[PDB]
Each structure stands twice: as C-alpha cells, then as structure tokens.
Amino acid sequence: FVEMVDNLRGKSGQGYYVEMTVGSPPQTLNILVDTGSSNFAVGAAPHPFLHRYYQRQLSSTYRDLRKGVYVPYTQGKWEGELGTDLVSIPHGPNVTVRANIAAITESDKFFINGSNWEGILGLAYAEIARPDDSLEPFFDSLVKQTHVPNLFSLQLCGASEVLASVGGSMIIGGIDHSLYTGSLWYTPIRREWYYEVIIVRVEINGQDLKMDCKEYNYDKSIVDSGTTNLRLPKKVFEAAVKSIKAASSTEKFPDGFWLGEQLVCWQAGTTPWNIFPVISLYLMGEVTNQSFRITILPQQYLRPVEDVATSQDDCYKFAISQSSTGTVMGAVIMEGFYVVFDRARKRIGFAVSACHVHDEFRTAAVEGPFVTLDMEDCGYNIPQTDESRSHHHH
Ligand SMILES: O=C(OC1CCOCC1)[C@H]1C[C@]2(CN1)C(=O)Nc1ccccc12
Numbered sequence: 001f002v003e004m005v006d007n008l009r010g011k012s013g014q015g016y017y018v019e020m021t022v023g024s025p026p027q028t029l030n031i032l033v034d035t036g037s038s039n040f041a042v043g044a045a046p047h048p049f050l051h052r053y054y055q056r057q058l059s060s061t062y063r064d065l066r067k068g069v070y071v072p073y074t075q076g077k078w079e080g081e082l083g084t085d086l087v088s089i090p091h092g093p094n095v096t097v098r099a100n101i102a103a104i105t106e107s108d109k110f111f112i113n114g115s116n117w118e119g120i121l122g123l124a125y126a127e128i129a130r131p132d133d134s135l136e137p138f139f140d141s142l143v144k145q146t147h148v149p150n151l152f153s154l155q156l157c158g159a160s161e162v163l164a165s166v167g168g169s170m171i172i173g174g175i176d177h178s179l180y181t182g183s184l185w186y187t188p189i190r191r192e193w194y195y196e197v198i199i200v201r202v203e204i205n206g207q208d209l210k211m212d213c214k215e216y217n218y219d220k221s222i223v224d225s226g227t228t229n230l231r232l233p234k235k236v237f238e239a240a241v242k243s244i245k246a247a248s249s250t251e252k253f254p255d256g257f258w259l260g261e262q263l264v265c266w267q268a269g270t271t272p273w274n275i276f277p278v279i280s281l282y283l284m285g286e287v288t289n290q291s292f293r294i295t296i297l298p299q300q301y302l303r304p305v306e307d308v309a310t311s312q313d314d315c316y317k318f319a320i321s322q323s324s325t326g327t328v329m330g331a332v333i334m335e336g337f338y339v340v341f342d343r344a345r346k347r348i349g350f351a352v353s354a355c356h357v358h359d360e361f362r363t364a365a366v367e368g369p370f371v372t373l374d375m376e377d378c379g380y381n382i383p384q385t386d387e388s389r390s391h392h393h394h
Pocket residue numbers: 032034036037073074075076110120222224226227325328
C-alpha cells in the first residue's frame with residue numbers, strides 16, 4: 001500500500017478526489033470520493049466548470065446501456081446516460097475493471113468551480129444506487145472481478161488568492177498501519193445502504209447532552225466523505241451550540257457565525273483554541289453494551305478560510321450545521337482519523353490519524369471501551385412509505 005498513500009487531493013470545503021482513468025484508450029479524470037452515494041458518475045458533456053470530460057465516442061471499449069439516469073440531491077442535481085467501460089485507478093490497485101458509468105449530460109449546481117474534479121465515486125451499497133439497486137456500484141464490480149478484499153480505508157488530512165489544498169489517502173483493499181496511531185476500533189454497520197452507524201452518547205467538554213440516544217440517530221447517522229461539515233439533527237444541534245456558546249462565551253459571535261454563514265477572525269496565530277470544547281461521540285461497539293468514543297477538537301469544527309482583506313488574520317468558519325435527515329459525519333470528523341470501511345465484516349473502524357492536526361494541550365482520540373448497563377436501543381426506524389413498500393427485489 002506504499003503506492004496508494006497521498007492519492008487524494010482537493011481544495012478545502014470542496015471535496016477530496018482521486019485520479020481514475022476510464023475508457024480505452026484511458027481517458028484520465030479527477031473523481032470525488034464520496035461514501036454517501038453509490039453511483040459512479042462522470043461529466044461527459046462540456047460545462048463551464050469542467051476543464052475536460054468523458055468522451056464515450058473516443059473509447060473502443062465503451063458499451064451503451066440505452067438507459068437514462070436522473071439523480072437529485074438536496075443541494076445539487078444531475079442527469080445522464082448509463083453505460084459500461086473499462087476503469088482503473090493509477091495510484092490504486094494494479095487492475096482494470098469493467099464498471100457501470102453514468103455519463104453526465106446536464107446538471108444544476110453539481111460541479112464546483114475550482115474544485116478540479118469531473119466525477120463522483122460513490123462507495124456505498126447498492127440499495128441507494130440509482131435508478132435502482134440492480135445497477136452494480138463500482139466497488140462491488142471491483143471486488144467481483146479481482147482478488148481485492150472487500151474493504152477500503154480513508155485518511156483525510158488537514159487544511160491567499162485560492163482555497164487551501166488538502167491531501168489524503170484512499171487505501172483500497174486493506175489497512176496501512178503507518179497511517180494511524182493507537183488502537184483501531186469498530187462500530188457495526190447497522191445496515192448496508194448508507195454507511196450507517198449508531199451513536200449512543202454525546203459529550204461536549206466531558207458534559208453529557210443527556211438526550212434519549214435515539215435523538216442522535218434521527219432519522220439516521222451516516223459517514224459521508226463528500227460532506228464537509230458535521231451535520232446534526234435539529235434538537236441535537238441546538239444543544240451542541242448552547243454548549244459551545246457556553247464555553248466560548250468570553251467571545252461574542254454574530255448569529256451568522258453559528259449558522260455557518262459568516263467568518264470570525266483573530267490576529268495571525270493568536271487564536272484562542274482553549275475556550276472551545278472538544279466533542280466526544282460514543283459509537284456502538286462490536287460487543288453488546290459496549291461503546292467507544294471518538295473525540296474531535298475545535299481545530300476540526302472551526303474551518304480555516306483565508307481572507308483576502310485581512311490576510312494578517314486567521315479566520316474560521318463554523319463547520320457544524322443543522323440537518324433534517326439525521327447525523328452526517330463528514331470530512332470535519334473524518335479528518336481527525338484514519339477511517340476503515342470494512343464491508344467484509346459489516347463494520348467501520350476508527351483510529352487516530354498519523355496526520356491529524358492538533359494543539360499542544362489536546363489531541364483527537366479514539367478511546368475505549370466504555371460499558372453501559374441495559375443499554376437501550378438507539379436506532380431509529382424510518383416510517384415505511386407505500387412506494388418503498390411496493391418495490392419487488394428478485
Ligand atoms: O447524497 C450525498 O450526500 C447526502 C448528504 C446528506 O446525507 C445523505 C446523503 C452525496 C452526494 C453529495 C454529498 N454526498 C450531495 O448530497 N450533494 C453533493 C453535491 C456535490 C457532490 C457531492 C454531493
């Protein structure tokens with residue numbers, strides 16, 4: 001896995017992306033790595049925001065599936081034409097794989113200006129693939145066609161005329177023990193659609209939020225490398241903020257700051273990290289009544305953004321935001337940790353990352369186990385729609 005290290009790049013807040021080739025001869029493209037979707041989609045038309053796109057007509061190996069796909073997000077939208085071609089990852093494994101590619105022909109608010117990626121690589125499970133679960137996702141194709149273990153791992157590393165560049169590693173097919181310190185800890189994948197986990201306890205600076213633990217997972221908690229922020233359900237969010245406000249109270253910030261809408265700044269290098277509390281999410285363990293905590297620093301949830309005006313200032317954006325769709329453990333969280341997506345054992349691994357950013361007082365941590373007597377169920381059960389209910393899976 002030597003040759004897989006440092007295979008991710010991107011700009012801060014705009015996504016981590018891996019270099020993939022597709023087609024024959026190999027058309028080379030930067031692709032966003034996104035564990036919260038399950039389609040492989042590539043720009044195949046010209047767009048204002050694309051330097052270069054997938055040209056099917058220039059690939060001998062391309063096969064058209066004569067099917068359309070249409071894929072809305074909450075923010076953003078794209079549609080395209082389904083097909084298959086040869087695909088490989090230069091700084092990934094030394095194989096080539098035939099895989100489904102959605103060729104994107106039109107899109108509203110999908111491609112980001114300056115982000116330098118032209119596709120998305122969803123690494124979640126078939127259930128949430130579009131247009132339905134029979135479109136075999138890339139990673140399924142990869143395992144099915146090669147001897148590559150059903151596992152991958154992500155180390156997303158940290159962040160004045162452009163955004164900051166970011167780096168990381170996507171290790172396909174196992175674990176690289178130079179990427180993490182300390183113990184590696186695993187929570188169950190509750191269910192294979194999203195990388196859904198369960199949170200059992202939340203502490204802000206060692207203080208329990210003291211909420212029914214269902215609230216932490218309403219209506220779901222997921223891990224999404226293609227979300228920047230830590231997203232939390234409204235009730236959890238508001239308590240988080242009350243508590244972060246509390247400890248930060250020496251400092252008085254405009255509404256817009258906490259809404260993720262505005263920047264706050266200090267003199268170059270005088271930023272007072274110590275009035276901001278660590279956050280600790282306890283995740284369900286592999287053993288019943290067991291949990292383990294990941295602790296993340298203010299350095300993670302305050303995101304540095306380089307001001308053009310006062311460039312003699314360090315300025316930060318609050319990267320916790322509100323959700324109506326449950327908890328999303330995005331890049332803000334992952335950036336503390338080597339995260340291991342162990343699909344073979346239906347589990348997610350966390351360890352402290354060999355690269356994670358910290359001050360001299362505190363450190364992001366993975367620390368367990370903890371035990372609760374008669375730990376109730378913290379899972380939510382999403383109301384079943386009749387649409388959903390009427391689907392046949394044969
Ligand atoms: O569907 C996703 O994330 C949602 C978020 C909340 O959790 C449920 C799943 C993928 C696709 C994504 C980010 N990750 C998205 O949504 N817009 C968007 C826009 C550009 C790139 C990637 C995405």
